[PDB]
Inverse folding.
């Protein structure tokens, strides 16, 4: 098992853990802020997903400082994880293209 | 099972404070919130506050003056609310409720009647209520017992320790000279009494009193 | 904060008829509304969650509908046990809030009071006190008068009355009337009579007894 | 084509149930939804529910008590609605309609009149209505026929099997002793009758009856 694949696997696991902790910590940051919607666990999990993917519909979003901090970690984990998958696909294609060229 | 357990009553002198408890059983999750809800006599439900025992974070209703302070004891699965500096406006039934972080209160405590006053605790006096002997019997017969001179509210009245439930009325207490009085009524087949026994059980949580009284015909 | 409006505050229906409770939110809250039942002396009990979702243990009779700002709790065919207050609660935005609640009231067939008088107890006399207790039980409607007479003469000093809320067993009401006296003043009279005047009878229902 | 076909009528004893059918023709797509819409006499359109036959998933109006249950038979291109435990409040015309998943009902069924009662089916009696002979003729002449003593609703009345449509009135039925009565009126050039023939055709779906009656002058 080559490095770029172990890392893509590791990244994906690590993102799922960030999604779960982020859901949990978002609700804990946002309860106590009047008007907040990010305040029950099921939809916080959906919110962490659509944040990690950078979709950001706008149905849900943090309004407190620490919910916004949790959001940033989730965004970075998500962009980084998907970028690491992209970089692993690059490595696979580049290796395959070496062989196909006899290099 | 009973998933949340709360004391029946606390009497608090004006200006004093009190710690209300709520011991949880059943499934407990890292994610569970314990909520507190106030109900004044003749009034609706009032959300006071919430705490997550696993992390110890608590939030309070802002819209109302903040006399409360919420803690939890993870070891004892017990949540505490400290209401401090109370007034007559704070006399109420205080419920606790459990919410799994998905927004609704699936299960509730029986609630603690908190009374703010300077009067002393007084266990009630229980008296039988069997008919006079010149009373004519129908196919049913009506018995009762009289709970008078107690303070504070509440008292619980059951009949034959819960087994009798059909045919039961308990009347709201009335307040007279700083003592409460109510009666309770039971109706059983005329047939069935006093052949089979009828007893009223009166618990008064504020004085840790429980008494039984058998209802026998008069001499 | 989200205000929840429940109106009307009281709802009167006849046995077995459909009833609908209204909840209105001051802004759109999706389907994040739950409904609770509180009987006399009881704690709230979850009936419906997320506007329309059944709770196991709850009669099929109950249903919920609505989204946005307008929500309804419905009982197809009311029965006596449904006599309670009904509260809605929103969890869309912090903090959670409750509506002010709606009472269900059932208009059942008229029913005459079953009246009982009880002389004071030997236990109570032993402590210098005497209470004569009258029960007026399981009548309908709730409008009722009780009169006391000692030795034929009306009495009003020392009379405390208490009325139950509508009974969740039979949709009737009940009332107690308690005349308290000294042992001494009780010993100084013969006959104690309790008289009930109710819509179901132009003649009063009367129960009495002689201390002798 | 006729794209949705529904039976004209079903009579249902109180408390019983009934399965309503809807056979689709024309283009059918994997994406098509079949909808059900209730209309009580003198009232508007009420959305009941929907099903997607290709996947078999169904949704129901929550705002109204749920007596219905929706199924489909992909083989027969037929959608079924089972209304169970009916009351007088359920007597209505029930339409089915087809929606291509883009939000509007492009095509509708003719609808099924569902009557909840304990009364028996009764085919109608049809009687001619030709003028008396002392009646003066204008440039037009008016004929009719009388549909009486039937139950339940409805009946369809046509004239010369649909070919006559101008000059036609059918009056709403009236209900008398648990039997319905209506009349229908036709107006043709005086010229054109009885030289050319005039017949009323009366179908009563609940009894699977259809009858013709020629309107000839009186003897």
């Amino acid at each position: 098992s080559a490095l770029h694949w172990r890392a893509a696997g590791a990244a994906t696991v690590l993102l799922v853990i960030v999604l779960l902790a982020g859901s949990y910590l978002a609700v804990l940051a946002e309860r106590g802020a009047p008007g907040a919607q990010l305040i029950t666990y099921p939809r916080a999990l959906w919110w962490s997903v659509e944040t990690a993917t950078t979709v950001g519909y706008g149905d849900l979003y943090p309004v407190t400082l620490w919910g916004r901090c949790v959001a940033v970690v989730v965004m970075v984990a998500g962009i980084t994880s998907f970028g690491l998958v992209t970089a692993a696909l690059a490595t696979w294609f580049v290796g395959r293209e070496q062989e196909r060229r006899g290099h | 099972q009973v998933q949340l357990q709360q004391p029946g009553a606390e009497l608090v002198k004006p200006g004093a404070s009190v710690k209300l408890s709520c011991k949880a059983s059943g499934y407990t999750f890292t994610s569970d919130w314990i909520h507190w809800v106030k109900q004044r006599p003749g009034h609706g439900l009032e959300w006071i506050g919430e705490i997550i025992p696993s992390y110890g974070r608590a939030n309070y209703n802002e819209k109302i003056q903040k006399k409360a302070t919420l803690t939890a004891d993870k070891s004892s699965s017990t949540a505490f609310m400290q209401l401090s500096s109370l007034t007559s406006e704070d006399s109420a039934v205080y419920y606790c409720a459990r919410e799994r972080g998905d927004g609704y209160f699936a299960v509730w405590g029986a609630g603690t009647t908190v009374t703010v006053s300077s009067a002393k605790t007084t266990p009630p006096s229980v008296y039988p209520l069997a008919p006079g002997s010149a009373a004519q019997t129908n196919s049913m017969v009506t018995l009762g017992c009289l709970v008078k001179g107690y303070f504070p509210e509440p008292v619980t009245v059951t009949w034959n320790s819960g087994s009798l439930s059909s045919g039961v009325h308990t009347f709201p207490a009335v307040l007279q000279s700083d003592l409460y009085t109510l009666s309770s009524s039971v109706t059983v087949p005329s047939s069935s009494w006093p052949s089979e026994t009828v007893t009223c059980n009166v618990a008064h949580p504020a004085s840790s009193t429980k008494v039984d009284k058998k209802i026998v015909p008069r001499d | 904060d989200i205000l929840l409006t429940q109106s009307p505050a009281i709802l009167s229906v006849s046995p077995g008829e459909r009833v609908s409770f209204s909840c209105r939110a001051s802004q759109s809250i999706g389907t994040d509304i739950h409904w609770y039942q509180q009987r006399t002396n009881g704690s709230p009990r979850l009936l419906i969650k997320y506007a329309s979702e059944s709770i196991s243990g709850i009669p099929s009779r109950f249903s919920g509908s609505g989204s946005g700002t307008d929500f309804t709790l419905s009982i197809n065919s009311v029965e006596s046990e449904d006599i309670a207050n009904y509260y809605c609660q929103q969890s869309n935005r912090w903090p959670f809030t409750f509506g002010s609640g709606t009472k269900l009231e059932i208009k059942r067939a008229d029913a005459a009071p079953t009246v009982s008088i009880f002389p004071p107890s030997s236990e109570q006399l032993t402590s210098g006190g005497a209470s004569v207790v009258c029960f007026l039980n399981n009548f309908y409607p709730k409008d009722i008068n009780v009169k006391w007479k000692i030795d034929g003469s009306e009495r009003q000093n020392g009379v405390l009355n208490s009325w139950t809320d509508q009974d969740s067993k039979d949709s009737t009401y009940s009332m107690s009337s308690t005349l308290t006296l000294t042992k001494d003043e009780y010993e100084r009279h013969n006959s104690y009579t309790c008289e009930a005047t109710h819509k179901t009878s132009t003649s009063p229902i009367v129960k009495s007894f002689n201390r002798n």
